[model samples]
Target: ERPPEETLSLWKGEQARLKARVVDRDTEAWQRDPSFSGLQKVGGVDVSFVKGDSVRACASLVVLSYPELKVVYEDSRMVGLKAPYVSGFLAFREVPFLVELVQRLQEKEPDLMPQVVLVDGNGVLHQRGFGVACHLGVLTELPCIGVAKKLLQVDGLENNALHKEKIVLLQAGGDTFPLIGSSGTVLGMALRSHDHSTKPLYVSVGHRISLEVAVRLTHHCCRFRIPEPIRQADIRSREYIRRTLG
Candidate 1:
C-alpha cells in the first residue's frame, strides 16, 4: 500500500527523522572475527543518474576478495527516481535504490555478502554528522565507510592546517598527508590515496567503524589514487548507464 500523495510529499521530513536515529558510535558491528581466516569480501557501491527527464537511476554493487582484489560478485539495479533531489540530503534521493540493490544481491547470493561496504558519499563528515553511508549502514546494519572525492565544508574547516596541507601535497603530487584536527572534536580526515594523484579523498567514520580503521582499510584498498573497489564500481555503473540508455 502506498501513502497518500500528501503524505508522500513529506518524505524529506521523514528522512530527516530517520537520519537522526543513526547510531554514529563504535559498536561490535565493526569488529571482524579474528579466526575467520582468508580474505574477507569487500564491496563498493556507486550510482549514476540517467540523462533527460526519465528520472532513472542505476545503483551498482561490486564485491571483491580483499588483498587479491578478484571480483566475486557484481550487481546493479535500475530504478525510477522517487524523491526529489535536495542539497545536503543526497541520501534521500539515492539510498532507497542502493538499499534495494544490496538486499536483492544478498537474497540472490547469500555467500557473496561483503564484510564491509565502501559507499560513494560522506558519512559523519556532513553538516548533520550523517550522510548516505550512515543512512545505508543503519538501514542494512552493515559496516560501511564513506569515501568522498571532495571535502565537505563542515564546521571548523575554515582554517584547518591539515586541509591546507592536503591541497599543497596534492597539487605537487607529493606523498600522502592525513587530515587530522579538532573540527568540533575531530570529524574526519582527508587522505591522499596515491603519491601521484592531484587530489585527496575525504574519509569519515560510517556507522560502527572508527575513523582510524576506515583510513587503514582505505589505504589497503588503494591500487591507484582512488580505491580499486570504488573505481571499478564507478566505471561499471557508467558503463551500465551507457549500455542501457544508448
Candidate 2:
C-alpha cells in the first residue's frame, strides 16, 4: 500500500513536467515529416490492470510490419503499479512497464524497432498535453502516436484537418470514407461516428512527426475497430495478464 497524498503529488508533478516538455508551439524542430513514412514496421503498446485493488498491471507490446501487417515480435512485462490511475498521469502507472517491455523486445529482437509506435492512450489530448504517447516517444526518441478509444478534449476542425499533399481512402461499412484531422499539434484525428457512422479514433503526434501526417496514416492503417498494432497489443494484454496471474 502507498500513501495517497504523496502518490498524487508525485503524479501531478511528473505529469506537469511531461506536459511542459512535450507541448510547445515555438520550440518544435520536427522535419514536418509524416510519422508514418519509412514505417515499414510499427509496434503497438497497451496495458491491462489487475482486477482487484492492488498495484498490479500487465503491459504488452506487439510489433507488426507495414503493408504486410505481420506480428514479427512480441513482449510483456508486469510491474508493481506505484501510482494510482490519475487522468493525466496514466504514463506514471503504465510507461515504466512499457519501457521495460520494450527493452525486453529490444534485447529479444533487436531489429524490430519500428519507425513509428502506436499507443493505446493519449498524446496531446491530456489536460497537461503530454500523455503516455508523448512520454514514451521522447524517452525512446521514436516517432509515435496516441490512438485512444476515447476522447480527452473538446476540440475539432470544421473542415478537413489533415494538411497533406497526398490522400488515402478510408472505407466505411459499405462505402469508401474520409478521415479528418481535427486538432492537437504533432497529432491528427480520424473519428468513426455512429449509425451509418463509425466510432472516432483519437490520433495525436508523439514526436518527430506531424499531426497532419499522422491523420492520413491513421486512416490508412485503420481497418476494423482497432488499428493493426494496437489491436494486436490489446489482444495480448489480456493474454499476458492471464498467463501471469492465472
Error of 1 at 155 (Å): 1.3
For 1-246, candidate 1 gives per-residue lDDT tens digits of 344566545754665676766665545543543422444788899887777744787778999898777788888767787767554577877887888878888799988888888888888777767788888888898888889988777665653685676577554322344544345367777777776676778888777777777776786788887787888888888899889776
User: How many residue pairs clash per model?
Assistant: 0, 11
Model 2 spans with C-alpha error above 4 angstroms: 1-10, 19-37, 154-188, 193-197, 244-246
Model 1 residue 4 CA deviation (Å) reads 17
Task: Report the lDDT tens digits of candidate 2 across residue range 158-219.
Answer: 32434221123333532222333245333345554122435567677776566655555555
For lDDT, the strongest prediction is: 1
List the pairs of residues colliding in candidate 1: none
lDDT of each: 0.75, 0.66
Alpha-carbon error at 225 in model 2, in Å?
1.3
Candidate 1 local lDDT, residue 68: 76
Segments in model 1 whose C-alpha atoms lie over 4 Å from true places? 1-39, 158-162, 170-183
